[PDB]
Symmetry: D2
Subunit: 493 residues, 4 copies
């Protein structure tokens, strides 16, 4: 009922939501429509850090609130770039598409997040190749079709067929195969670098989880994403318009990856968190034949097959842990008993950690053979117990800066104060001599399923002997846990 | 051996092995599956926190306070036994919470089983008893200098208050009265439970906490008050105590009684009610229980957590279709519609006995407006919320003792007029929210007319948006104009 | 070119080159040498912050609010010119502060020059004029689309209010009335200045802020109110606004009116008074000014900052010995002694005209106690503190307009009884603190007897520690018992 | 007036002070007595980060509140060690002595902190060797004697002559020269590791400034000192009782030094902060002949000589900046004009940064010769201006992990869960391959005093040419600031 320039003013109030990390954030009605579906709300029932909650009691947070944050930050970054550089022709349509990709990037996660596609599926169904990102595309497709989203998209200026395609590409990368994308052309290449940056890993997904995980874990975040946004520009690089950082911000970018690595070290790869994820996975494996999840057309699926039907998968969340824990079916007794050991805190025992020494890398193909090697070690120590291959767990962890052996900063372009449209490269030696010499490494953790004092003492001897035999690094506590073993290796002394 | 645990609120805290033994049981770990703020998570997306981590915090703060008092006043004879007993009471105070915490004993049980009188605190005593007996805790307690019979009793008293109908406690004598004021302070509500939840809820909600519990600890002393040794606050800290209760009230206002959070709790409760005949939970000796009867068997109750929401949501049983359909409406965000809020005006108080009659009153209002729809009693929800400073109409600060710089062993009282004229005139009030289950535009417009008419008829306060939502109704009331 | 600056409160903020030009002048940089909380730093060791960084924050928030309003409501026709003018007013609002901020115009100038009527805000207009003229700012303003004559006028109005004795402003018309509500809101005190200092003072003091300014910005709209376009808050945010003023009051209570902070400000003021005849500050055309007369010459005033404290402390001039000796007593922590606090009881208000007569009243009390010492009027300090919600006896929320979800262009009013019965009954009060300059044990004991007797005689409130400090006095008053 | 076991209870209320970093902290009356003196209160008038405030507007904090924090943390650490290990025989006397050393460690700082002994004194008085720590001992001596502290110390169980000596040793290191300390014996060696740890730099001083500087700067701290305290033990190492960290905390210790280095990089060595410190120092140098500060017995001192008299030095604080800025004396016109240029933000212009390339290290002896080298470069670029040696500033910054080329973690001892009284060593390769290869480096910043556009363009050419000539690293913006220079160096391409 008010008018301006002779035309009625239309007042379209967006929803506001209060997030502890980002504060009050506004959700466009199209985003709200996507959010308020069973496919999205599902993420309220999947813990971000999976078994991490059982080590860090503040880590109760779920994928839901992280996804809101990623959607929010994706819009923040696209907006800022467009405000500073109208010549990029960023449209509100582009903004919404990037926000939706941000919201939906995690739709394909399963129970306990990385445990599911990182540990359980590879063991339960070795023949398949599954990733949560592939799952996200499929779940996104299912969300769109089950909830009549396409007309709503059209109502807000989106072109569903192109834009749905574009959203999927942002999530999973090129869907085929030159310019490998179809959703947007090379002059909007920078749009693909926002949600999941496949080129250097600098994206808003990291920015949300650094801040959010830190807030819940009780560890302080030292990366400043807002500063980065302020100094970001888009410049021509090899015929694409790409996001570039201010040159003198290079030190902060090295620190960003250092932070990521510290979070993995301190929290995500915590030795006990990992063994809990291992134990939950074992329980799921023993339950997989007996739990039924109804999918499309009444068809029955298992925990390991629900990934083949998005209707079943919608109902596959951290709830499966409690379904198992609370079950009475005698067929679920073995699975149930593993979860009960978690509750009593009768966990597999951590024996130690070591690393390879040369340019030596342990191949994934050989992971399964490692417990046998440990059990075959011949420690010159008088022991009350003999241990078998099946008593040992050997967990191999690849730690890197996101691009295996490569330095991600070699794949970042920068600009200088005096010529802000000119993209440049900065090499490691131009920055600092105190930076990492290498960008990838492997940690090897060993655990024992026999938890009594005698078995644990024995396990430590087998383990350190195995490290000696393989020319691995001397465990930090080697001289204390295995004083009779460590002298034999003079490379260690 | 003791353990260190990293909590985002309190940082690195040490757990004595006896506490660890209590924590690592099914009865305690259960609290990982019950959200602190229940349906609040569906309004505040940061409120994913569970009772588990809150209970750790309460146990920690209880030890902090008891330790501090003991270090400053060795004459109190606080033993490590006393410290452990207070820590255990802190840990176990919430053991009796059910699915979605306050929703369960606040909304569901009163409706599902009107004949019983159930509180989570009573549940906590029973669950604590079950924890002790099922996990062989008594020998471990003995190993660390506790006297199980006395101390178990003491712990229970700390949780629920005097266990019988003069010094009414048996676990500890009057010279250690201050020990009963730590976990759940029945006299004035100043306790470590509040201190943890202010800080923790604020951290997750995205609202900032303004109360400083550490300051309070620093200024706390124990003084003689009528043959008891009681905790006293420094006199000039009285303003901070009034602010503490103000903070509690702001948290209820902003978050815990959020109009949408409450309607979600209402809807979940409706779903539980429609599921209650059909869900089975196996308890002791294979006996079957229902959601509403699991409170009678701690073995069944152990398996009753927020999981019940998802069991219902994921069910295929046709008998659960109605329950399931309510939860699906939550997911689609098809919620009951908020109509408005009002309060009583005089010294008028709405009695609990009359709550059930209110939707009928609203439906029976006769608004002089032409409407396309007629609404019935069953279309309206009327939610009555008692807001107070924890002791109904009473000022909790009248039940606090203080000490002065010049005579730190002498307990004194401070009255409201000795502090400030800007403090509340009264300490309790009622908020009345009205919602409509019919969500279409025409029903909602009608509901607003019935509501404002009802407010006029009852001499309630004029709704804030009254002139906008019901312009034809508000003129009739000249008390409003 | 614009600059980015990292502030601990607001993070990375952008400064338009015109703002940078204003900031990089002696008149602005001066604020780096004036502590926000004056003597508060001597009680709260984190309160080292200066007016400079607060002014940056206010400028930043002023732009944030104006931008947000403009983005949601293009029909307001907010220009980048308007934005810059509001930002500049935000930056420059505090230019007129003197040494130790509120101590200077609140304590020192009233005592050193009773004939004048000086406020820091008037000072800010004069210093702003001097900044513009001494640094050739007008051409730079023109370069960025400002119209200097009009806009300089507008900026001054934002700072100090209407410049003359119906729409009383000339810088902008009624359709941009909302622009005058941003920096210093004379109508209800809801402005960005408070928002910065709540957050900044809390960060430095070690007290937590509970008001959320960002939420407020999100819910703010501009609506027609009597031919003006004014800022309106969402109706259901009314509780947060009452909390905002409560927070302000708690900050005054806990920090800004701390009894020791105030006595330090008092002592510094005494030192300045004893130094005022002897310190020379060169102003325009080589003329000499004093601490008390530098307010008459902006060139001299530019060089008048907290540095004066150290000039006095480090001086060797025998004429400055008395001033210097007061500051040395601050360093040794030989401060005047706090005797107690009381308030008036009826609708009684102590008039400013009578403040100077109060120490004499205290000294003239006749306590029936045997004392070793007799005290004189000059031994007592009586500090009268007016605590209110910013508009003396008035409720600021009666001067706030709101909007409702269903009609967001329609301004409405909300009354106190529509909100809550737990809110303050009144909105202003007076605290009376009494101190003694004689610090020995016998004098302090005597001072307490005179004080409590005086409270009894005047029917003031019973001091909290009254029965402890003056057990022979308190029984006489049965209103107290 | 209350009694227990027949004896009157004495209630001794400590002062409580609210600090934004540590919260409410209790001050023993002896500490209060030390604090409330002109010598201590002086630290309220000296900014922690000196000229840093002119770049980071939150950095208004002074040495005073930092010193309170260090005193507090020193007591926290000593207390915790004593609570866990009564066998160490830590007395309340020991605790107070460590707290006092913590409070007083910074007493010798001058105007703008590190600017004074780092920049000004070396230039104003090259013949002397002055450090703030030496100053702290002298000021501490002066504080004790001027305020009658010794009797108060005795009253609280201290033995002044021994303990004053001990406090001084904690501050400055061994006062002479086997066990080189006299204040305490080898069995209390760990007490010397608390305030200023001369062996590996792990001390409470760092812990306070990380947290405090971060709070004021608007940068987030990622080191957790409370965690460290929880895991600290004292163990026998080579006949001393020394502080040891839990073995698995080694990663956190590497991160602690990384944090220190990031704070230097981001804040303390900020290129503009440093040039402001340089300009203030220049102003002090031009004022030094004309400012008089009265010391003991009425003797007159200068800014550069006040370090010889603690009575004069007591009155030498950041106030000297404003005395100069506000002066009217024509003799101070040159000094005053430099400070006025700071206020107008007419600063010397930053030209660029480079590093040495080989095992090459620039010696301190050659610092003064560097501007001349830059001016002597012969860039093949057509320029409107010729620049002289005196137009250039060359600032050489040594960045390291606190022990020059050494790895501080090689000087840390650890303990293991299974044998908590046994000290062990952990080597770099036992931890991670992603850690620094080197632990020290030099940054070279160049600035120009001529600020016009033409001089700055020229300065950039001279600078990059100089980098080429010396085989220094290619400046990050080299190709942008000096496109005609960078091609000549093929080591750069
Ligand atoms: N007073 C408050 N302070 C901080 N956050 C709040 C407050 N009240 C609610 N929130 C949170 C909860 C939500 O995440 C978000 C929005 O809540 P709110 O504004 O109450 O939305 P709503 O949908 O209930 O109101 P409406 O639909 O009437 O606008 O802010
Ligand atoms: N580097 C870290 N920084 C902060 N918190 C941590 C770190 N590592 C672990 N945590 C958290 C997780 C837990 O809540 C708590 C205890 O972890 P941790 O010290 O790893 O115990 P642990 O039981 O695995 O080791 P151990 O049994 O060998 O002492 O600290
Ligand atoms: N790495 C950092 N992280 C956080 N804050 C920083 C960092 N570096 C500098 N700051 C702060 C100091 C200032 O308040 C603000 C601007 O600093 P900076 O970006 O260094 O500007 P500058 O003026 O020195 O660089 P230039 O002129 O080359 O853009 O940011
Ligand atoms: Mg809503
Ligand atoms: Mg452990
Ligand atoms: Mg710059
Ligand atoms: Mg005091």
């Amino acid at each position: 009922n008010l008018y301006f320039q002779g035309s009625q003013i239309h007042v379209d109030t967006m929803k506001v939501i209060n997030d502890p990390i980002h504060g009050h954030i506004e959700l466009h009605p199209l985003l709200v429509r996507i959010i308020d579906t069973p496919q999205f709300q599902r993420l309220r029932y999947i813990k971000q850090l999976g078994g991490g909650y059982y080590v860090f009691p503040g880590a109760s947070h779920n994928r839901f609130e992280h996804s809101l944050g990623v959607g929010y930050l994706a819009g923040c970054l696209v907006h800022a770039l467009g405000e500073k550089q109208p010549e990029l022709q960023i449209s509100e349509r582009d903004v919404l598409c990037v926000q939706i990709a941000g919201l939906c990037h995690d739709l394909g996660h399963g129970p306990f997040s990385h445990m599911f596609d990182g540990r359980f599926i590879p063991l339960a169904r070795p023949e398949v190749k599954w990733t949560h990102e592939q799952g996200s595309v499929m779940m996104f497709e299912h969300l769109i079709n089950s909830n009549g989203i396409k007309p709503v998209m059209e109502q807000y200026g989106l072109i569903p067929e192109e834009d749905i395609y574009f959203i999927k590409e942002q999530i999973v990368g090129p869907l085929e195969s030159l310019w490998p994308y179809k959703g947007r052309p090379e002059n909007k290449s920078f749009l693909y670098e926002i949600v999941s940056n496949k080129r250097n890993g600098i994206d808003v997904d990291k920015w949300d989880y650094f801040a959010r995980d830190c807030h819940h874990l009780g560890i302080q975040n030292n990366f400043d994403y807002k500063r980065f946004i302020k100094f970001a520009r888009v410049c021509e690089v090899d015929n694409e318009l790409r996001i570039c950082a201010r040159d003198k911000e290079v030190g902060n970018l090295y620190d960003m990856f250092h932070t990521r690595n510290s979070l993995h070290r301190r929290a995500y790869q915590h030795k006990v968190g990992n063994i809990i994820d291992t134990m939950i996975t074992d329980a799921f494996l023993k339950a997989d034949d007996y739990i039924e999840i109804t999918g499309a057309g009444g068809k029955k699926y298992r925990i390991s097959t629900a990934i083949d039907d998005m209707e079943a998968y919608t109902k596959l969340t951290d709830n499966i842990f409690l379904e198992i824990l609370y079950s009475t079916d005698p067929k679920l007794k073995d699975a149930r008993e593993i979860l009960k050991q978690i509750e009593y805190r009768n966990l597999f025992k951590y024996v130690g950690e070591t690393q390879p020494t040369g340019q030596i890398k342990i191949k994934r193909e050989d992971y399964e053979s490692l417990p046998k090697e440990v059990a075959s070690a011949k420690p010159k120590v008088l022991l009350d117990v003999k241990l078998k291959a099946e008593d040992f767990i050997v967990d191999v962890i690849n730690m890197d800066y996101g691009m295996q052996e490569k330095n991600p900063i070699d794949h970042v372009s920068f600009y200088c104060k005096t010529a802000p449209n000119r993209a440049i490269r900065i090499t490691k030696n131009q920055v600092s001599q105190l930076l990492p010499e290498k960008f990838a490494e492997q940690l090897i953790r060993v655990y024992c399923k026999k938890v009594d004092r005698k078995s644990l003492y024995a396990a430590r001897q087998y383990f350190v002997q195995w490290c000696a035999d393989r020319n691995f690094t001397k465990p930090q506590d080697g001289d204390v846990i295995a004083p009779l073993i460590t002298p034999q290796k003079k490379e260690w002394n």
